[PDB]
Symmetry: D2
Subunit: 396 residues, 4 copies
């Protein structure tokens, strides 16, 4: 058990809205700020960090190796190596899985793992500029669609594919809007109660006329109602059910945490928040966007030797309200135990950071509630799912 | 021995030149072709593949998750998960290290790992197109520079930084050109002897006029001489030493291999080529581009409990001739044991595939020569190094 | 006197600000709207229009032959030919000079002449996209700079060259700012008195949420003060004097008028506004941006057999406050007779339309004041000037 | 005879192929070279040049006022004014008409008129780059299509519209290919006989390894046969008749000449080549691309008091073989008098220069053959036509 792998000091920036407060702040700078703050608050000797692993999906234009920028600009010694992982919308949780594997295999003793993303900062791409278009009009591609949200096999948006999940599982528009309004209401009430203050580190943004201290999530809509959501038009198919109100936005943020054995965390005076009891990574047909969390959660629960009913809360990414409903109802999870404090429809989905954001949220929620067992899971894009089974570590 | 981690069936495409035969073939398609060929030749049951891990540096414009495209278009079942790693010029070796860690930690039993890159296919980037340039001229950035070759902290080319390595270690232009000419001569003789045929899988490219069967490396320059290299102008600093002739090109290629325990490989009827005996990952100041292999090799050798003199061959990426000379000389390696069959100055440096290409090269060279111990190492970009200590597995 | 060449029915749109009300309305559409309104108000038989000539500088992206689009989309019969002229910032006056030449040479009897511009609608240019950039970063050029405001020989902005005019004529910063503040004051007072209502035709702009009727100039800055202008930084040279406050903006608009002999105008029931008594086109060194009006005015006055002191008002384009001061003081024009109702620093400089706008302003101002003699003149860019000497025609 | 308007010293570059020898040489540099050579060969006193007028269609990216660049870099004194005209594919002939109107109206006494174009050098346009694309892919437009070859009302290529002319006049594919093969054969034989050497001025192109002297037209295909043309696929409509072999290419070149009264040319020691006896400019429905030369020719002939049978040769631009056939057969012109030495299918169509190239060709051909009367005409784009009726002037 001393060899159990634990997460300590999980922290996140607030999440920016599209064209919002973080629109001019690169993803790697958001990560560097979290890492700098984590080092400050823990007092961890920076030389005890063996590697930095960061998730980031839209690497275009972010410069050589985002994770190395996070590490060096986060103030770690230049001797700390770093690399960037991409499992699309699961990347921030993949970074933690990568850290687990490096610790259990003996390659590292302590890793800073997390993820970063800023969708406004994703550039446009000009595939014909290197060797020429020659004659005739040519296209400039939005990288957030080409590398992040469109399926690589069909070139259709993930939301377009999710309409086929909607049809297969008969998920009504009204159920999606009810779930979305509930996510907004749960999130706003938790935010108002101060429940996210412990996990959020403020970022100071410098502008022309001055400075903004960005300290609280800004992308949520607390006035959302089922009635207002029913006014909206479908976003991905003319006859569809998915709208801008029952899907997350295009967001920016970062989160990071310390991954180590429990023995190492105790030795260094850290306070572990969660032990990783199981990991699942699964894949399905790419067109079946949204279902991957079901087999991945089953794998993670098998490794943990837990059943669904043993779990106090599930935190499953709300890539679309439809995905949350399908996963919840396929696994038979109680609605009061699913995305308890709201999810990405409210707070935003900064794709390569969201898995780390969900781990951070669970670390702090279990501390507050004294719940013992949680599962974090995300659909990937391209037909994959990732899940972690997590248990609270008591305060020593 | 059961749980030693081994590499089996390492294979690679030939390496394309800049603006060359592979210029219209995406990196993910190159990887898919190697993986399809690997599955066909080994007869490995596709359901035994637990994950595909691919290195790729210039992910811009390649579509969602290059590794998943490699896996699915390589013909693996959609149930095989996949993810893409980026440790810059070490990414293809990082994929193998990631596979090692997944197997030793129990997350996987068998992984297909490798790397892919196509520098011609890297797009240009327009940072001001989303929200507008408003007024005044604006820049379109070459992604291969912004995301691959320029340092992220200084925005200078890696070759500009390597001039400071050259100055610190007093690496003469004459020695850089001697090393580059030797790499071309060694590679040309090995290619003519057929020494790369076993590791290469041909790729058929469909063009306007018909089909080209691309079957052998095309980027080397057998016309290279030291006298010719001495005439070239410096590429990165006015009074510099690094030129287009003592640096590799901007290349395309892919390589992949099976990583598993030795017991799993024997059970499934594979023929292991190499056992991973040590892994080193190190970092230094970003400005000291090129030195990273020295500490990384020392880490890998310490894990293997080998000394430099025990190693039959070192395969260290020739990111510039100057880097090869510094690493060789600082570790005291004999020149006949350093990049024995030539290196990237001759064959090319498709950045995210090169580490997997070098592992492939060593797997086949140790089989041919019966040498026992090798080290593969690459500098990263950004001040890092990766190294693996590798031992031949008998037939 | 029957064969004298006259201007009738001069009209203009209001002038839009940069990123303002006309930002989505192409220059050719602005011209079409003026031409359609001119035809409706005059009742001119459309078959009597022999040609349409329009000035336009930033032709990039406007589609084949802007003048033909203005004519056809303005409702003229397809049998009316049309062509587009470019003498940079003098293009809208050049269109009238071209019309004069076609009528006096017998090629035409009646021409609709004017100019159009919309600086927001100027695209960016990618010179390397056709045949490729190959390797290394490449530039996307702002067409308004490449084709409109930068000198073609030096690639420096016209405002950079004007700093040498400032140094040659010892034009103080304080005098430039006084001239700019006075232009704003004169314009704001004339606008409030209703003096621009007769020349302006409103344009209705359709948007997502509805419609805007754009009916009055929007680019002026009536709360400009000399003290506020003194705080601004130089725009073109570190140690310069020209700023954003003593130069016009980047504007959009159109203007058009009928040009014919006097006999033809009377025959067709038009009411001539001005007779063209002299035309001057001159050129000087490109680096001497701003001086061209001086020799051009002298040529136009020589043709008209007038002296400077015979002229009731000069309307000289305020490309920069410094140009207005140099031209006024070199010719010895009384300040109360120079840009009497304000100029482009206040109302805007939609480059290819401005010459037609100034002719329109003078036609209406002389009608209102009963002044007899005026001169319109503009510097061009590239070291040229254009001028017309104009006399009021009494009502029939 | 005194005040008749004459053309002297007409000269042209050779015409470059698309992606050919002139691909790196701006249009304005081609014109400056012709003007410099014209001044050197005639010995004309540069102070006697009153204006430079140049046609140019694809002005995007060519810098401020192409005609002023031609004049200044051609070595004329900076005191010579200049402006650029755009009547699409008739621009180079429009520059001569503009010069005629300025001389007859008394604005000028001697003008250098011509046209320039380089289609390789036309840039791509990015309409969304100024104010952003926000989200989603966006288009980069080829300026040669947007501003030169596509109709401004339909956005279809001029060749697509010409398929309707083909259908209206029942112009068979076999006839189009016969006309195109004959144009190639006539051009190749005339070129081999040396008949274009007198009008061409060589251009020296500086390249990597050294210098190329470009001295002869390169875009023609002397091996063209009717049987080879029959194999080609239609270029503009799937069921079409127009192919890359019965249409011109995308070419580069320049041409210029001196325009003055006959008395002025004699006074200055020039040798007039042609007198302008009639000018016609006509317009028709835009969709009837290609028919415009018919009414324009009729107007020019009426001005000259000539009929078709009085004309020794017609030089009508081969915008497509179909256009040449329709114009020839509607006017009843003898086939051996229509495009006698070949036309643009063979030599190329550098759009803004072609009208000036055709005038140059006729000036030299009439001198060689002692023919007396010729007509030059071009379709415009957008449903217009321009024509000039021209008579040889004897040597003094
Ligand atoms: C791994 C994968 C995934 C995914 C996803 C998703 C979310 C899509 C929402 C996005 O399309 C949203 O509707 C955009 C609204 C932007 C509106 C604006 O321009 O402000
Ligand atoms: C991880 C890092 C790295 C690195 C490196 C490198 C190689 C650079 C060589 C490249 O600059 C080469 O000189 C380009 C020549 C291209 C010439 C052409 O346009 O054909
Ligand atoms: C023929 C020639 C000319 C000319 C001229 C001019 C005016 C230049 C003013 C322009 O540079 C102005 O300062 C631009 C301000 C725009 C600020 C914004 O982004 O809103
Ligand atoms: C004013 C008007 C007009 C016109 C016109 C025209 C000519 C079009 C020929 C062009 O479309 C040709 O097909 C282009 C071939 C280029 C092929 C290549 O890429 O090399």
């Amino acid at each position: 058990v001393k060899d159990e792998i634990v997460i300590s000091s999980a922290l996140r920036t607030p999440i920016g809205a599209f064209s919002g407060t973080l629109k001019d702040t690169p993803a790697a700078a958001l990560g560097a700020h979290v890492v700098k703050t984590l080092l400050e608050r823990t007092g961890l000797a920076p030389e005890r960090v063996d590697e930095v692993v960061m998730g980031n999906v839209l690497q275009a234009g972010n410069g050589m190796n985002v994770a190395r920028q996070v590490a060096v600009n986060g103030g770690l010694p230049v001797a700390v190596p770093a690399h960037t992982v991409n499992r699309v919308c699961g990347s921030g949780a993949q970074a933690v899985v990568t850290a687990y594997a490096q610790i259990r295999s003996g390659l590292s003793n302590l890793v800073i793992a997390g993820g970063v993303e800023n969708m406004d900062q994703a550039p446009y791409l000009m595939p014909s500029l290197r060797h020429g278009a020659r004659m005739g009009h040519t296209q400039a591609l939005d990288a957030l669609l080409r590398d992040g949200l469109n399926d690589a096999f069909s070139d259709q948006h993930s939301g377009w594919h999710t309409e086929d999940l909607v049809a297969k599982y008969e998920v009504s528009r009204e159920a999606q809007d009810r779930f979305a309004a509930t996510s907004q209401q749960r999130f706003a009430a938790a935010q108002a109660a101060g429940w996210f203050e412990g996990e959020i580190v403020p970022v100071t943004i410098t502008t022309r006329k001055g400075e903004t201290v960005f300290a609280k999530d800004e992308a949520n809509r607390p006035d959302t109602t089922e009635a207002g959501l029913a006014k909206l038009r479908p976003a991905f198919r003319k006859d569809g059910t998915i709208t801008a109100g029952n899907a997350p936005g295009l967001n920016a943020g970062a989160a990071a945490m310390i991954v180590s054995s429990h023995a190492t965390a105790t030795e260094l005076g850290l306070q572990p928040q969660l032990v990783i009891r199981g990991i699942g990574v699964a894949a399905v047909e790419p067109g079946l966007f949204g279902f991957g969390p079901v087999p991945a959660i089953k794998l993670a629960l098998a490794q943990a030797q837990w059943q669904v009913q043993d779990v106090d809360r599930f935190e499953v990414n709300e890539a679309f309200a439809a995905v949350g409903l399908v996963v919840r109802d396929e696994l038979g999870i109680a609605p009061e135990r699913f995305n308890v404090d709201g999810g990405a429809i409210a707070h935003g989905h900064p794709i390569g950071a969201t898995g780390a954001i969900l781990l951070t949220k669970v670390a702090h929620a279990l501390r507050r509630t004294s719940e013992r067992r949680a599962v974090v899971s995300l659909c990937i894009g391209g037909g994959q799912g990732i899940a972690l089974a997590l248990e609270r570590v008591k305060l020593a």
